[PDB]
Amino acid sequence: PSEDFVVTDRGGIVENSHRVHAAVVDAKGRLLYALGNPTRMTLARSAAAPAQALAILETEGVAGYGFDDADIALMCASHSSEDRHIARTRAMLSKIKAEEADLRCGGHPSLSEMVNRSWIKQDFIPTAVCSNCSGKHVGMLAGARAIGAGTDGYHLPDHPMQGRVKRTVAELCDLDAGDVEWGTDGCNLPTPAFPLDRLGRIYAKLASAADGSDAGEGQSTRCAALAHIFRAMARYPEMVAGEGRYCTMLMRAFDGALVGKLGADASYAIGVRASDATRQLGTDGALGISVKIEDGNLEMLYAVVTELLERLGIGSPDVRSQLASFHHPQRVNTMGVTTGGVSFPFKLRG
Amino acid sequence: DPFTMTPSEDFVVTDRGGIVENSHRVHAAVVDAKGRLLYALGNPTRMTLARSAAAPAQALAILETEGVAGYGFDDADIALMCASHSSEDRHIARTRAMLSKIKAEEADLRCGGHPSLSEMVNRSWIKQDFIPTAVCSNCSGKHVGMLAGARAIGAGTDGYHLPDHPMQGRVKRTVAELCDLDAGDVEWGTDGCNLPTPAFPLDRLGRIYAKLASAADGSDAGEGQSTRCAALAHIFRAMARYPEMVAGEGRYCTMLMRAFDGALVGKLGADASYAIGVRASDATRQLGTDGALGISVKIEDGNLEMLYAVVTELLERLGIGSPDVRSQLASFHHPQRVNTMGVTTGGVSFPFKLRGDDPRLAAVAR
Ligand SMILES: [Zn+2]
Ligand SMILES: [Zn+2]
């Protein structure tokens, strides 16, 4: 495994360096390109949300609630707690006849500094309905209600809804139950850990299912649900994160060519639909990308993800230039002087 | 394998339920009053931007500027020269009092405003829609001292912050001399407050602080000192007596220095460097030196929360502190990992190994 770093400098002098791991996999999960240790055991955190959305959508009876594509995107989200995410959360609660008091997630400072500053000015204390995970929680309420399971402990590991989540994660990873480890996330759900390349496998299967759907293929019910999830994220990326957020600007820039998702502590995953770019990389199908910054730095994650799309030729220069402020973050001091930059001395191995 | 551990494996690590979340490479040097390396983590000579952990050397360059003594700066003013302060009202007030002492105005500052280094101060700013200005800079005390030096020598206050200005020529020389380095062995960038900022091997940052602490020792014992040594001792005394000017309420540097009640001074450098100067004590003697001691730390990826955890762990391993004094730092030592429903999800640990084994075990500094 290579010593792959992203490095920041001040006047050419090394400031910080961050170890990068990355996996690029085809639709079956075969490893195509790598940085660092592409199989590093990694907490997927909220980059697992589409698999959790799959578990929700595959639960008997959930279809009768009439969740729409923006609802599903919110199930996939780490949203910024904008008023529009709160509103959709309440509208999802109304659809399943539940109440904010039924949520088992808690409030937290918004993932958007601008939202949080507006909260601070107004003395606003976030509650359960503000959780960046509030959409997947409503979905898990919905699933528990759907099969009659009882709603108080829908978040606990021994509840049938978390059993479905756990089975669904392992099946998407093509792992045995024993090879996925579990802790607890900030929103109080079980959260999985598995080799980094398998996170890319999940998103390659999202993008693969989307390709099979627009191609009129016989699809399994699971493939069709994955296709729907892809479609929902790509259509409502503002629900997946929010205004000014990397995930939203990425997906907006690519206009349905890919879906992408943040994991807390600096994981990222992308599913890329089949394209001239994927074919040039040497695969006849969809593509998956997963990334982990070893030390957890988000600013460096987004810089590295954007540099990696460039290395991979994914997008056009014009399309990627929408992400320019993430690719080379601003390094400007309190008097407007540029003090340094970011570098990418890493080499993608194939 | 505990019998093949290497500096490349010196890490501080967070976990979720025992599953590794993040890991951060640790570099540290522990040196005696002459800079002799006593203990190390990672690469103790890593070329490193000291950032505002260099501030006591800039304060020294200010105080050794002929004619500055006539302004009547007091020990709290000097502590503020050594500061990365929280932009509390008292820090802003002292900045304006220092401007008045040298007959200058806020428009003479060449630093700019920025969100407070204190979350609580920043919250009050956000409520009031307050836009911070030059006089709010965490470096304002330093900048005023540089204005004072430029005035005292007749240099001209426009440009005091630029490398070619004699005040910055004084800084650059003073820094190299404290590190015992030739000029070509210190590199220079520009910091957030718009001053030249130095980079030199990590151990030399410990060297500067060992020299602060040593000078304090000599002054307190009544030894005849050079003008420089007496000035170092004054800087030490100022930081240790007014630690709230060096940082602010709730800040690590202030809580560290209050807890130790004069036994040491310590200072943050941005992007996760730390420096501590320790007066001679039973603890330093058990560590095997007959004088003062300096410590310098760098988290490679720049994480501050991990910095404070690591510095506190390292003080415990060095036997510096009592569990009682060091217990005021307990929230820094083991950062809370509690989710939005009050459940603890994980923790920090310190898989690093202080060195200073089989002779065939190479200690390749990395
Ligand atoms: Zn969550
Ligand atoms: Zn400064």
mmCIF file of N, CA and C in Angstrom, chain A residues 34-134:
data_model
loop_
_atom_site.group_PDB
_atom_site.id
_atom_site.type_symbol
_atom_site.label_atom_id
_atom_site.label_comp_id
_atom_site.label_asym_id
_atom_site.label_seq_id
_atom_site.Cartn_x
_atom_site.Cartn_y
_atom_site.Cartn_z
ATOM 1 N N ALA A 34 -6.698 2.375 -6.727
ATOM 2 C CA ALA A 34 -6.613 2.524 -5.276
ATOM 3 C C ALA A 34 -5.664 3.649 -4.923
ATOM 4 N N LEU A 35 -5.941 4.275 -3.777
ATOM 5 C CA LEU A 35 -5.000 5.044 -2.959
ATOM 6 C C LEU A 35 -4.894 4.417 -1.578
ATOM 7 N N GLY A 36 -3.701 4.521 -0.983
ATOM 8 C CA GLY A 36 -3.499 3.994 0.361
ATOM 9 C C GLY A 36 -3.954 2.542 0.496
ATOM 10 N N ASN A 37 -4.782 2.263 1.499
ATOM 11 C CA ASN A 37 -5.207 0.883 1.759
ATOM 12 C C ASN A 37 -6.660 0.779 1.332
ATOM 13 N N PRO A 38 -6.952 0.305 0.116
ATOM 14 C CA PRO A 38 -8.340 0.328 -0.348
ATOM 15 C C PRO A 38 -9.256 -0.595 0.462
ATOM 16 N N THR A 39 -8.720 -1.493 1.299
ATOM 17 C CA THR A 39 -9.575 -2.368 2.115
ATOM 18 C C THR A 39 -9.526 -2.030 3.594
ATOM 19 N N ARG A 40 -9.129 -0.810 3.941
ATOM 20 C CA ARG A 40 -9.085 -0.393 5.337
ATOM 21 C C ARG A 40 -10.441 -0.580 6.001
ATOM 22 N N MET A 41 -10.461 -1.240 7.159
ATOM 23 C CA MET A 41 -11.702 -1.363 7.914
ATOM 24 C C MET A 41 -12.187 0.023 8.299
ATOM 25 N N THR A 42 -13.418 0.364 7.915
ATOM 26 C CA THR A 42 -13.858 1.748 7.995
ATOM 27 C C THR A 42 -15.323 1.837 8.391
ATOM 28 N N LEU A 43 -15.600 2.657 9.393
ATOM 29 C CA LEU A 43 -16.937 3.130 9.730
ATOM 30 C C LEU A 43 -17.541 3.937 8.605
ATOM 31 N N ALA A 44 -18.516 3.357 7.929
ATOM 32 C CA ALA A 44 -19.147 4.042 6.807
ATOM 33 C C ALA A 44 -19.955 5.235 7.270
ATOM 34 N N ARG A 45 -20.431 5.190 8.518
ATOM 35 C CA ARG A 45 -21.250 6.244 9.093
ATOM 36 C C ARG A 45 -22.408 6.564 8.162
ATOM 37 N N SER A 46 -22.706 7.842 7.940
ATOM 38 C CA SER A 46 -23.891 8.132 7.154
ATOM 39 C C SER A 46 -23.711 7.896 5.653
ATOM 40 N N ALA A 47 -22.512 7.558 5.176
ATOM 41 C CA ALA A 47 -22.455 7.109 3.794
ATOM 42 C C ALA A 47 -23.164 5.772 3.589
ATOM 43 N N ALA A 48 -23.568 5.096 4.666
ATOM 44 C CA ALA A 48 -24.374 3.885 4.543
ATOM 45 C C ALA A 48 -25.858 4.183 4.347
ATOM 46 N N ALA A 49 -26.294 5.438 4.472
ATOM 47 C CA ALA A 49 -27.726 5.743 4.444
ATOM 48 C C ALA A 49 -28.481 5.152 3.256
ATOM 49 N N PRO A 50 -27.958 5.097 2.028
ATOM 50 C CA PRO A 50 -28.758 4.435 0.969
ATOM 51 C C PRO A 50 -29.088 2.986 1.275
ATOM 52 N N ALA A 51 -28.165 2.228 1.874
ATOM 53 C CA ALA A 51 -28.489 0.854 2.252
ATOM 54 C C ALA A 51 -29.561 0.828 3.325
ATOM 55 N N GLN A 52 -29.514 1.769 4.262
ATOM 56 C CA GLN A 52 -30.588 1.879 5.244
ATOM 57 C C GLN A 52 -31.908 2.254 4.576
ATOM 58 N N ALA A 53 -31.852 3.107 3.553
ATOM 59 C CA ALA A 53 -33.056 3.412 2.784
ATOM 60 C C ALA A 53 -33.574 2.176 2.064
ATOM 61 N N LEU A 54 -32.660 1.325 1.579
ATOM 62 C CA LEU A 54 -33.075 0.096 0.915
ATOM 63 C C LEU A 54 -33.812 -0.818 1.880
ATOM 64 N N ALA A 55 -33.250 -1.010 3.079
ATOM 65 C CA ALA A 55 -33.924 -1.773 4.116
ATOM 66 C C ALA A 55 -35.319 -1.222 4.383
ATOM 67 N N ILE A 56 -35.443 0.103 4.503
ATOM 68 C CA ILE A 56 -36.758 0.710 4.731
ATOM 69 C C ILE A 56 -37.704 0.398 3.569
ATOM 70 N N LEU A 57 -37.273 0.675 2.332
ATOM 71 C CA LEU A 57 -38.163 0.446 1.194
ATOM 72 C C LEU A 57 -38.496 -1.016 0.973
ATOM 73 N N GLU A 58 -37.654 -1.927 1.419
ATOM 74 C CA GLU A 58 -37.972 -3.329 1.243
ATOM 75 C C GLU A 58 -38.843 -3.884 2.362
ATOM 76 N N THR A 59 -39.257 -3.056 3.322
ATOM 77 C CA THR A 59 -40.075 -3.539 4.435
ATOM 78 C C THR A 59 -41.541 -3.640 4.032
ATOM 79 N N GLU A 60 -42.161 -4.770 4.375
ATOM 80 C CA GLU A 60 -43.543 -5.022 3.988
ATOM 81 C C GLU A 60 -44.462 -3.916 4.488
ATOM 82 N N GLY A 61 -45.296 -3.398 3.599
ATOM 83 C CA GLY A 61 -46.272 -2.377 3.931
ATOM 84 C C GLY A 61 -45.790 -0.940 3.815
ATOM 85 N N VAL A 62 -44.480 -0.707 3.755
ATOM 86 C CA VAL A 62 -43.993 0.672 3.700
ATOM 87 C C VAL A 62 -44.515 1.399 2.452
ATOM 88 N N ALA A 63 -44.781 0.659 1.366
ATOM 89 C CA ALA A 63 -45.237 1.281 0.127
ATOM 90 C C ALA A 63 -46.573 1.995 0.303
ATOM 91 N N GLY A 64 -47.411 1.543 1.230
ATOM 92 C CA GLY A 64 -48.723 2.164 1.328
ATOM 93 C C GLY A 64 -48.727 3.551 1.940
ATOM 94 N N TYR A 65 -47.607 3.990 2.508
ATOM 95 C CA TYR A 65 -47.507 5.345 3.029
ATOM 96 C C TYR A 65 -47.333 6.403 1.941
ATOM 97 N N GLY A 66 -47.002 6.027 0.714
ATOM 98 C CA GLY A 66 -46.892 7.039 -0.321
ATOM 99 C C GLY A 66 -45.733 8.004 -0.145
ATOM 100 N N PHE A 67 -44.594 7.521 0.338
ATOM 101 C CA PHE A 67 -43.383 8.334 0.301
ATOM 102 C C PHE A 67 -43.014 8.628 -1.155
ATOM 103 N N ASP A 68 -42.570 9.870 -1.444
ATOM 104 C CA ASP A 68 -42.195 10.244 -2.811
ATOM 105 C C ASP A 68 -40.674 10.349 -2.942
ATOM 106 N N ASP A 69 -40.206 10.758 -4.126
ATOM 107 C CA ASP A 69 -38.772 10.703 -4.386
ATOM 108 C C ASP A 69 -37.999 11.662 -3.482
ATOM 109 N N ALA A 70 -38.553 12.851 -3.214
ATOM 110 C CA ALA A 70 -37.874 13.749 -2.272
ATOM 111 C C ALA A 70 -37.831 13.158 -0.858
ATOM 112 N N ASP A 71 -38.907 12.476 -0.445
ATOM 113 C CA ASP A 71 -38.899 11.740 0.816
ATOM 114 C C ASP A 71 -37.773 10.716 0.852
ATOM 115 N N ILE A 72 -37.621 9.931 -0.215
ATOM 116 C CA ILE A 72 -36.555 8.937 -0.207
ATOM 117 C C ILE A 72 -35.195 9.625 -0.141
ATOM 118 N N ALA A 73 -34.991 10.684 -0.944
ATOM 119 C CA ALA A 73 -33.737 11.426 -0.802
ATOM 120 C C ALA A 73 -33.510 11.838 0.648
ATOM 121 N N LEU A 74 -34.565 12.228 1.362
ATOM 122 C CA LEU A 74 -34.282 12.704 2.708
ATOM 123 C C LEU A 74 -33.881 11.510 3.575
ATOM 124 N N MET A 75 -34.433 10.328 3.287
ATOM 125 C CA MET A 75 -34.016 9.096 3.972
ATOM 126 C C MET A 75 -32.545 8.821 3.770
ATOM 127 N N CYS A 76 -32.008 9.220 2.623
ATOM 128 C CA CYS A 76 -30.604 9.028 2.296
ATOM 129 C C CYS A 76 -29.696 10.131 2.826
ATOM 130 N N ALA A 77 -30.209 11.109 3.555
ATOM 131 C CA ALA A 77 -29.515 12.381 3.743
ATOM 132 C C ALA A 77 -28.667 12.441 5.014
ATOM 133 N N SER A 78 -27.727 13.396 5.012
ATOM 134 C CA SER A 78 -27.156 14.043 6.204
ATOM 135 C C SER A 78 -27.435 15.519 6.000
ATOM 136 N N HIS A 79 -28.675 15.919 6.225
ATOM 137 C CA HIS A 79 -29.080 17.211 5.715
ATOM 138 C C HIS A 79 -28.640 18.319 6.670
ATOM 139 N N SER A 80 -28.732 19.549 6.174
ATOM 140 C CA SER A 80 -28.222 20.721 6.866
ATOM 141 C C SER A 80 -29.218 21.290 7.865
ATOM 142 N N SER A 81 -30.361 20.627 8.076
ATOM 143 C CA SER A 81 -31.393 21.115 8.995
ATOM 144 C C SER A 81 -31.962 22.470 8.557
ATOM 145 N N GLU A 82 -31.990 22.732 7.252
ATOM 146 C CA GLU A 82 -32.718 23.886 6.759
ATOM 147 C C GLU A 82 -34.202 23.713 7.046
ATOM 148 N N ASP A 83 -34.919 24.841 7.081
ATOM 149 C CA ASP A 83 -36.352 24.784 7.344
ATOM 150 C C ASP A 83 -37.042 23.801 6.409
ATOM 151 N N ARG A 84 -36.543 23.666 5.170
ATOM 152 C CA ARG A 84 -37.172 22.743 4.224
ATOM 153 C C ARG A 84 -36.919 21.280 4.582
ATOM 154 N N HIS A 85 -35.796 20.965 5.240
ATOM 155 C CA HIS A 85 -35.604 19.603 5.730
ATOM 156 C C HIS A 85 -36.497 19.334 6.939
ATOM 157 N N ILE A 86 -36.661 20.323 7.816
ATOM 158 C CA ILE A 86 -37.585 20.160 8.939
ATOM 159 C C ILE A 86 -39.010 19.934 8.421
ATOM 160 N N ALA A 87 -39.429 20.760 7.461
ATOM 161 C CA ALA A 87 -40.780 20.668 6.939
ATOM 162 C C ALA A 87 -41.043 19.305 6.318
ATOM 163 N N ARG A 88 -40.108 18.798 5.507
ATOM 164 C CA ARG A 88 -40.332 17.490 4.895
ATOM 165 C C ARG A 88 -40.358 16.395 5.953
ATOM 166 N N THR A 89 -39.524 16.530 6.982
ATOM 167 C CA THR A 89 -39.526 15.583 8.092
ATOM 168 C C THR A 89 -40.899 15.504 8.735
ATOM 169 N N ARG A 90 -41.493 16.663 9.033
ATOM 170 C CA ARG A 90 -42.838 16.684 9.590
ATOM 171 C C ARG A 90 -43.858 16.124 8.604
ATOM 172 N N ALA A 91 -43.704 16.428 7.310
ATOM 173 C CA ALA A 91 -44.632 15.856 6.339
ATOM 174 C C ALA A 91 -44.477 14.344 6.251
ATOM 175 N N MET A 92 -43.270 13.809 6.467
ATOM 176 C CA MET A 92 -43.126 12.349 6.486
ATOM 177 C C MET A 92 -43.770 11.736 7.741
ATOM 178 N N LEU A 93 -43.477 12.289 8.931
ATOM 179 C CA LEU A 93 -44.252 11.978 10.139
ATOM 180 C C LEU A 93 -45.763 11.990 9.936
ATOM 181 N N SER A 94 -46.306 12.987 9.230
ATOM 182 C CA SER A 94 -47.753 12.993 9.065
ATOM 183 C C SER A 94 -48.203 11.823 8.211
ATOM 184 N N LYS A 95 -47.391 11.436 7.231
ATOM 185 C CA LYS A 95 -47.804 10.370 6.335
ATOM 186 C C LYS A 95 -47.944 9.052 7.078
ATOM 187 N N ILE A 96 -47.102 8.810 8.084
ATOM 188 C CA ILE A 96 -47.163 7.565 8.844
ATOM 189 C C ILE A 96 -47.913 7.735 10.161
ATOM 190 N N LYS A 97 -48.561 8.885 10.375
ATOM 191 C CA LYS A 97 -49.374 9.148 11.566
ATOM 192 C C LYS A 97 -48.552 9.106 12.853
ATOM 193 N N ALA A 98 -47.319 9.605 12.809
ATOM 194 C CA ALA A 98 -46.440 9.650 13.974
ATOM 195 C C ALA A 98 -46.198 11.097 14.413
ATOM 196 N N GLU A 99 -45.384 11.258 15.457
ATOM 197 C CA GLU A 99 -45.137 12.557 16.082
ATOM 198 C C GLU A 99 -43.644 12.706 16.351
ATOM 199 N N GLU A 100 -43.171 13.967 16.423
ATOM 200 C CA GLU A 100 -41.765 14.212 16.740
ATOM 201 C C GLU A 100 -41.333 13.463 18.000
ATOM 202 N N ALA A 101 -42.223 13.361 18.991
ATOM 203 C CA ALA A 101 -41.896 12.627 20.213
ATOM 204 C C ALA A 101 -41.551 11.162 19.949
ATOM 205 N N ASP A 102 -41.960 10.606 18.802
ATOM 206 C CA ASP A 102 -41.622 9.234 18.448
ATOM 207 C C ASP A 102 -40.202 9.066 17.920
ATOM 208 N N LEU A 103 -39.554 10.133 17.455
ATOM 209 C CA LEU A 103 -38.163 10.023 17.026
ATOM 210 C C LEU A 103 -37.236 9.655 18.178
ATOM 211 N N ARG A 104 -36.217 8.849 17.870
ATOM 212 C CA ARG A 104 -35.182 8.455 18.818
ATOM 213 C C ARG A 104 -33.803 9.002 18.447
ATOM 214 N N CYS A 105 -33.738 9.998 17.566
ATOM 215 C CA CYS A 105 -32.538 10.799 17.329
ATOM 216 C C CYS A 105 -32.606 12.102 18.124
ATOM 217 N N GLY A 106 -31.456 12.756 18.303
ATOM 218 C CA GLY A 106 -31.450 14.028 19.024
ATOM 219 C C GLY A 106 -30.963 15.215 18.191
ATOM 220 N N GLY A 107 -31.265 16.439 18.633
ATOM 221 C CA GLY A 107 -30.807 17.615 17.924
ATOM 222 C C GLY A 107 -29.322 17.846 18.122
ATOM 223 N N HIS A 108 -28.750 18.707 17.260
ATOM 224 C CA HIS A 108 -27.316 18.934 17.239
ATOM 225 C C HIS A 108 -27.035 20.188 16.421
ATOM 226 N N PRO A 109 -25.923 20.886 16.659
ATOM 227 C CA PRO A 109 -25.586 22.023 15.794
ATOM 228 C C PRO A 109 -25.648 21.609 14.332
ATOM 229 N N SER A 110 -26.204 22.494 13.507
ATOM 230 C CA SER A 110 -26.411 22.182 12.097
ATOM 231 C C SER A 110 -25.089 21.917 11.372
ATOM 232 N N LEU A 111 -25.117 20.971 10.410
ATOM 233 C CA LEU A 111 -23.946 20.688 9.564
ATOM 234 C C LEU A 111 -23.577 21.834 8.624
ATOM 235 N N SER A 112 -24.433 22.848 8.526
ATOM 236 C CA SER A 112 -24.162 24.077 7.811
ATOM 237 C C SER A 112 -23.855 25.177 8.824
ATOM 238 N N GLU A 113 -22.655 25.770 8.725
ATOM 239 C CA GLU A 113 -22.307 26.852 9.651
ATOM 240 C C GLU A 113 -23.280 28.021 9.521
ATOM 241 N N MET A 114 -23.690 28.336 8.296
ATOM 242 C CA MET A 114 -24.637 29.424 8.096
ATOM 243 C C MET A 114 -25.983 29.159 8.775
ATOM 244 N N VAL A 115 -26.504 27.920 8.709
ATOM 245 C CA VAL A 115 -27.730 27.605 9.448
ATOM 246 C C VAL A 115 -27.501 27.749 10.948
ATOM 247 N N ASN A 116 -26.391 27.190 11.441
ATOM 248 C CA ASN A 116 -26.104 27.243 12.866
ATOM 249 C C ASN A 116 -25.989 28.678 13.354
ATOM 250 N N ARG A 117 -25.320 29.557 12.582
ATOM 251 C CA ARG A 117 -25.222 30.963 12.984
ATOM 252 C C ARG A 117 -26.607 31.596 13.090
ATOM 253 N N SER A 118 -27.503 31.275 12.160
ATOM 254 C CA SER A 118 -28.877 31.768 12.249
ATOM 255 C C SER A 118 -29.601 31.205 13.478
ATOM 256 N N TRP A 119 -29.345 29.943 13.829
ATOM 257 C CA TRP A 119 -29.913 29.387 15.055
ATOM 258 C C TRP A 119 -29.383 30.101 16.284
ATOM 259 N N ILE A 120 -28.068 30.370 16.303
ATOM 260 C CA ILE A 120 -27.442 30.972 17.474
ATOM 261 C C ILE A 120 -28.019 32.355 17.707
ATOM 262 N N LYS A 121 -28.182 33.118 16.630
ATOM 263 C CA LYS A 121 -28.751 34.456 16.743
ATOM 264 C C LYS A 121 -30.144 34.425 17.377
ATOM 265 N N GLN A 122 -30.922 33.370 17.112
ATOM 266 C CA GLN A 122 -32.320 33.301 17.525
ATOM 267 C C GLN A 122 -32.526 32.451 18.771
ATOM 268 N N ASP A 123 -31.447 32.107 19.468
ATOM 269 C CA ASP A 123 -31.518 31.297 20.687
ATOM 270 C C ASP A 123 -32.221 29.958 20.444
ATOM 271 N N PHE A 124 -32.089 29.396 19.243
ATOM 272 C CA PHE A 124 -32.841 28.193 18.883
ATOM 273 C C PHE A 124 -32.106 26.933 19.314
ATOM 274 N N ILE A 125 -32.803 26.074 20.056
ATOM 275 C CA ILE A 125 -32.262 24.804 20.532
ATOM 276 C C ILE A 125 -32.793 23.690 19.626
ATOM 277 N N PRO A 126 -31.957 23.058 18.807
ATOM 278 C CA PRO A 126 -32.478 22.002 17.925
ATOM 279 C C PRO A 126 -33.032 20.827 18.727
ATOM 280 N N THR A 127 -34.069 20.205 18.180
ATOM 281 C CA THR A 127 -34.665 19.021 18.782
ATOM 282 C C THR A 127 -34.575 17.856 17.797
ATOM 283 N N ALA A 128 -35.303 16.777 18.106
ATOM 284 C CA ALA A 128 -35.205 15.542 17.330
ATOM 285 C C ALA A 128 -35.469 15.781 15.846
ATOM 286 N N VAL A 129 -36.495 16.571 15.528
ATOM 287 C CA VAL A 129 -36.911 16.784 14.145
ATOM 288 C C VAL A 129 -35.860 17.509 13.310
ATOM 289 N N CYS A 130 -34.844 18.084 13.960
ATOM 290 C CA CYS A 130 -33.754 18.784 13.282
ATOM 291 C C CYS A 130 -32.573 17.884 12.946
ATOM 292 N N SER A 131 -32.530 16.677 13.491
ATOM 293 C CA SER A 131 -31.415 15.779 13.256
ATOM 294 C C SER A 131 -31.115 15.664 11.770
ATOM 295 N N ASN A 132 -29.822 15.701 11.427
ATOM 296 C CA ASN A 132 -29.443 15.493 10.032
ATOM 297 C C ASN A 132 -29.907 14.129 9.522
ATOM 298 N N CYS A 133 -30.183 13.196 10.432
ATOM 299 C CA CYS A 133 -30.649 11.859 10.124
ATOM 300 C C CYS A 133 -32.159 11.714 10.264
ATOM 301 N N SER A 134 -32.899 12.817 10.381
ATOM 302 C CA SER A 134 -34.306 12.699 10.753
ATOM 303 C C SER A 134 -35.116 11.933 9.697
#
